[PDB]
């Protein structure tokens with residue numbers, strides 16, 4: 001698994017864009033996130049990625065500042081988010097083009113990990129491929145997955161823009 005994702009380092013925000021605290025799972029090289037962080041200085045981010053070759057690229061980018069963003073390697077499927085992220089401390093979690101890469105059987109080990117750090121009021125902005133080594137999701141299969149892992153859906157919607165899905169789920 002991670003082997004394939006690490007080989008690649010040798011799927012972008014699309015108008016998805018205060019004391020906001022945010023986590024970007026599968027941050028990547030943080031191409032969209034780092035610009036956002038410069039534009040607003042309030043935002044503190046915890047960026048986590050499966051591949052270490054990606055985390056070094058993230059540190060290399062000039063935009064990277066250590067006091068507006070914390071970057072750490074983590075496999076959400078097995079590694080624990082709480083060890084680097086304080087509990088119920090995040091106002092936004094963004095799963096963008098990342099749940100697809102995770103296997104369906106393990107796909108909820110992440111929604112649960114993200115769940116502990118998410119503040120009870122705050123939600124999880126989602127952006128991923130839909131249908132009607134990634135996998136694609138029908139709008140119902142996905143809403144069930146947050147429901148199975150305890151989150152409550154505010155928005156689930158396919159975008160035609162190969163398909164995309166825009167979904168917002170709120171932790172109770």
Ligand SMILES: Nc1ncnc2c1ncn2[C@@H]1O[C@H](CSCC[C@H](N)C(=O)O)[C@@H](O)[C@H]1O
Nearest residue numbers: 026027028049050051075076096097098101
């Ligand atoms: N189980 C897993 N644990 C951690 N990161 C994972 C993962 N499965 C996929 N990823 C990460 O998912 C990311 C998706 S692509 C990068 C993010 C995208 N550019 C954005 O703007 O959000 C990759 O960086 C990959 O390493």
